[PDB]
Structure formats: structure tokens, C-alpha cells
Amino acid sequence: AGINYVQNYNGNLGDFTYDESAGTFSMYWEDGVSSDFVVGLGWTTGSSNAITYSAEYSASGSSSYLAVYGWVNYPQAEYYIVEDYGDYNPCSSATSLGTVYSDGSTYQVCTDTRTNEPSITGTSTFTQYWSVRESTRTSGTVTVANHFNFWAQHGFGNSDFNYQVMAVEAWSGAGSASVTIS
């Protein structure tokens, strides 16, 4: 793996353990949360290399995602490749970009603009790009390049990356995750 970055945004709202050299982390929020956390492991600089993972992920009562997650510095953008999620599909609500096919499934692709929200430079306005897997799963390989190349047709900068992680996010409800990045 060569993990060199630990993602912890409000991880203290649940129980987050990890081991960088093994590439594994777990996150338990059995009691529920009513604020946003994002936790995971990855790299201080993103790239388009494939990521392979294996997880147990249980969040059907939760507004949550199991995702490849990271940022582009300029133009400022937050992105997700959502492999499995709970009760909330971010593309229901957002502007549709079409469909991409990759690694065994179609993904719905969409984008949204977030204004004055927490970001890698503090509080700012940025674009989000989402690929949401049509057949959800909790293990496999994400050929990141196929998503980046599609989003790049729609303004994604596709270079000048900040961090990139395999992550679990939840902001409501309860569940449980355990993830290995190989």
C-alpha cells in the first residue's frame, strides 16, 4: 500500500482505529451520530493509480458512504467514488453529468457546488464530483483513472491533487466499518 496519510475529520464522534503499515482501519458508530465525520487512510498526494480494497460495511440505517475520497487544489474540488452507501444518494439531488462504466458496473455521475463550507483551505466555495456505483459492493478494485478522465470532460482539473484516501463518512444514523487497502 505505501499509506502515508491518515484522514480524521471528527473521528472522535465514534470509535476510529487504524494501522498505517497494515493498511487497515475500522470505524464504529453503533450509537449514532448527528454530525459529519470522514475517516480513512491514504496518501498526501492523490493520483490516478488503481486502489484495491476489502471491507465490511454495515450502514443501511445511516446517511453514510464507503468511498474513494480526496481533493484537487485548483480549481478547488472535492470528489468521491462511492462503492456502497446507506440511505442517501447524493446524485438524486445534484446536477447529472451522465454515466461512466468501470470495474464491473455503471456509475451515475453528478456534480454540485458547495458555498462557504469546510474545505481544505478552511471555509470556501468548491465543486464536488461524484461517481456512485449502480451495483454497490464492499470489495474490489477502483480504476480511478476511468472516473478522473470522465470528470475531466466536465471541468475536473485532473492534476494538482491534494490528499486521497479510502474513506468512511457518515453524518446521521449508526453503523460499522472495517476496511483493508491492499
Side-chain angles (χ1 to χ4, degrees), residues 51-155:
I51 300 168
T52 300
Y53 67 100
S54 201
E56 293 159 22
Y57 174 68
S58 179
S60 56
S62 202
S63 304
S64 176
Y65 307 125
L66 175 63
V68 178
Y69 173 70
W71 283 85
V72 162
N73 289 313
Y74 190 76
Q76 197 178 63
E78 176 183 54
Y79 63 80
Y80 288 86
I81 301 159
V82 181
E83 290 293 277
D84 198 359
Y85 55 98
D87 64 29
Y88 179 70
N89 187 322
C91 287
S92 286
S93 175
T95 123
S96 179
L97 296 176
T99 287
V100 72
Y101 186 89
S102 193
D103 304 291
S105 180
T106 52
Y107 287 72
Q108 205 177 329
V109 176
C110 66
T111 180
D112 198 12
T113 299
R114 307 312 297 172
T115 63
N116 317 303
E117 285 199 1
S119 70
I120 44 172
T121 49
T123 285
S124 65
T125 288
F126 53 96
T127 300
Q128 286 177 322
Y129 291 88
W130 300 84
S131 293
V132 184
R133 201 174 166 93
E134 218 104 62
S135 312
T136 60
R137 63 178 179 174
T138 60
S139 141
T141 292
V142 181
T143 306
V144 172
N146 291 333
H147 295 277
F148 279 8
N149 285 336
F150 185 81
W151 298 342
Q153 285 172 25
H154 297 285

